[PDB]
Amino acid sequence: AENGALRKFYEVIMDNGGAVLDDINSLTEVTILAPSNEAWNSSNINNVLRDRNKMRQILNMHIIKDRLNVDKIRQKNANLIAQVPTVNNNTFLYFNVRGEGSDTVITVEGGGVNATVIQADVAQTNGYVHIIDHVLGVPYTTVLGKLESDPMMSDTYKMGKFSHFNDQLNNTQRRFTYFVPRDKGWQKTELDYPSAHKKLFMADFSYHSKSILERHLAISDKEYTMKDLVKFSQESGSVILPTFRDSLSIRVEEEAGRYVIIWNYKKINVYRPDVECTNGIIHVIDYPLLEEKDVV
Ligand SMILES: *[C@@H]1O[C@H](CO)[C@@H](O[C@@H]2O[C@H](CO)[C@@H](O)[C@H](O)[C@H]2NC(C)=O)[C@H](O)[C@H]1NC(C)=O
């Protein structure tokens, strides 16, 4: 697209303030992820498109406070995954790069959205511009849809299959807040409790794995953003959320920009907070809510 995409990006900025344009021009380095025109339409963001306050938040997360081209992205993700900050100080992004040359496939994950770069390295004065096929910050998948499409959630998604725990996550009549342990988290659990870990991924113990996951799943009429949990555990003592057959009592705090979860005697870092979905929100955590009282 490019031609159509960029003008559309600016048109959207015009409809919602213009304040966005100020922040962009006040940056020494800036990289914009401009959704294709097809992305701005098929997104059917008709709902939020009218909310000028939200549109600004959506627009802001498409603006990277840095000079980032394909090469730089590849490099930054060499050792670990680089979480890239945006104008939206409540949303960061990160990329995944596959193949090389004309076979290169670049995708980005942000605000609950996974988009593919359909055009990259468009030069700019202080940076670059890339065209993506989806509008970040506007989920087009349910919690379940996300779980099957996010490689980082592969273990938790697979574990929820043995007991058909996942089935329910497609329901649009409820709102789920799923605290999803990332793959690295389950791998760590494998080192801590190799036998119990082998069991969680066995049909024979579907009951156990379901019980473990239901502990991570909050079901209510509303979804809780990490910022909500903080406010709750701040005004009140801790936070109490309804799970499937019981409840979840945790406490959330801010720590050097990241959010932290205090469950029982454990402290787990929230790796990807607020991964919004159409029927809820997902919070990727560093380690699963597990004590060795569920292992022996
Ligand atoms: C966005 O979603 C896609 C689709 O699931 C992810 O693509 C996979 O990426 C892994 C890691 O390179 C590959 O092993 C798979 O083969 C890819 N699937 C396909 C068919 O494309 C992609 O990684 C996600 N992007 C992010 C940043 O999470």
Which residue from 73, 92, 104, 107 has its CB within 8 A of the most atoms of ligand 1, so it is best to mutate?
A: 107
Q: For 161-198, give one letter per residue: b (16+ CB within 10 A) or e.
A: bbbebbebbeeeeebbbbbbbbbebbebbbeebeebbe
Give dist(CA 3, CA 19) in Å, integer.
23
Give dist(CA 143, CA 153) in Å, integer.
11
Which residue from 73, 96, 130, 182 has its CB within 8 A of the most atoms of ligand 1, so it is best to mutate?
A: 96
Output the CA 96–ligand 1 centroid distance in Å. 7
Output the CA 161–ligand 1 centroid distance in Å. 20
Give dist(CA 182, CA 147) in Å, integer.
11
Query: Could you tell me the two tokens for 257?
Result: 């920009």
Q: What residues does ligand 1 touch, defined as CB less than 6 Å away? A: 94-96, 98, 107-109, 114, 149-151
Give dist(CA 17, CA 10) in Å, integer.
11
Sequence-separated (6 or more) residues with CB below 8 Å from residue 51: none
Q: Measuring CA to CA, how many Å separate 5 from each of 41, 175, 193?
A: 11, 33, 50
Best CA proximity match to 138, nearest among 270, 259, 13, 276: 276
Give dist(CA 284, CA 165) in Å, integer.
18
Output the CA 148–ligand 1 centroid distance in Å. 11
Burial class (CB in 10 A: 0-12, 13-18, 19+), 107: middle
Output the CA 271–ligand 1 centroid distance in Å. 18
Structure-token match 């104008």, residue found: 87
Residues in the chain: 296
Contact 91, 62 (CB under 8 A): no
Give Dmax over CA atoms of the chain in angstroms: 61
- Angle at CA 83, nearest 5°, toward 287 and 15? 120
Give dist(CA 89, CA 57) in Å, integer.
9
The three-state (H, E, C) secondary structure of the chain, written as one string = CCHHHHHHHHHHHHHCCCHHHHHHHCCCCEEEEEECHHHHHHCCCHHHHCCHHHHHHHHHCCEECCCCCHHHHHHHCCCCCCCEEECCCCCEEEEEEECCHHHCEEEEEECCEEEEEEEEEEECCCEEEEEECCCCCCCCCCHHHHHHHCHHHHHHHHHCCCCCCCHHHHCCCCEEEEEEECHHHHHHHHHHCHHHHHHHCCHHHHHHHHHHHHCCEEEECCCCCHHHHHHHHHHCCCEEEECCCCEEEEEEEEECCEEEEEECCEEEEEEEEEEEECCEEEEEECCCCCCCCCCC
Which residue from 73, 76, 150, 152 has its CB within 8 A of the most atoms of ligand 1, so it is best to mutate?
A: 150
Sequence-separated (6 or more) residues with CB below 8 Å from residue 153: 146, 147, 180, 182, 183, 282, 284
**Nearest Cα residue to atom 5 of ligand 1:** 149
Structure-token match 């910050």, residue found: 137
Torsion, CA 181, CA 187, CA 192, CA 194, rounded to 10: 120
Atom of ligand 1 nearest to the CA of 109: 27
Sequence-separated (6 or more) residues with CB below 8 Å from residue 75: none
Experimental method: X-ray
Count the Cβ atoms, other than its own, within 10 Å of residue 76: 18
In this structure, the strands spanning 127-132 and 30-35 are: parallel
Q: How far is residue 102 CA from its own chain's centroid?
A: 28
Contact 280, 274 (CB under 8 A): no
Q: Mind listing the domains of the chain with CATH numbers?
A: 1-140 (2.30.180.10), 141-296 (2.30.180.10)
**Nearest Cα residue to atom 15 of ligand 1:** 151
Q: Can you say whether residue 222 is alpha, beta or left, with left for phi > 0 and alpha for psi between -120 and 50 degrees? A: beta
Output the CA 107–ligand 1 centroid distance in Å. 7
Query: Could you tell me the two tokens for 284?
Result: 């990727």
Contact 29, 65 (CB under 8 A): yes
Give dist(CA 77, CA 97) in Å, integer.
8
Output the CA 288–ligand 1 centroid distance in Å. 23
Contact 87, 63 (CB under 8 A): yes
Which residues in the chain are followed by a discontinuity, with C-to-N distance exceeding 2.5 angstroms? none
Question: For 55, how many CA atoms within 13 A lie in the half-sphere containing its CB?
Answer: 22
Output the CA 95–ligand 1 centroid distance in Å. 10
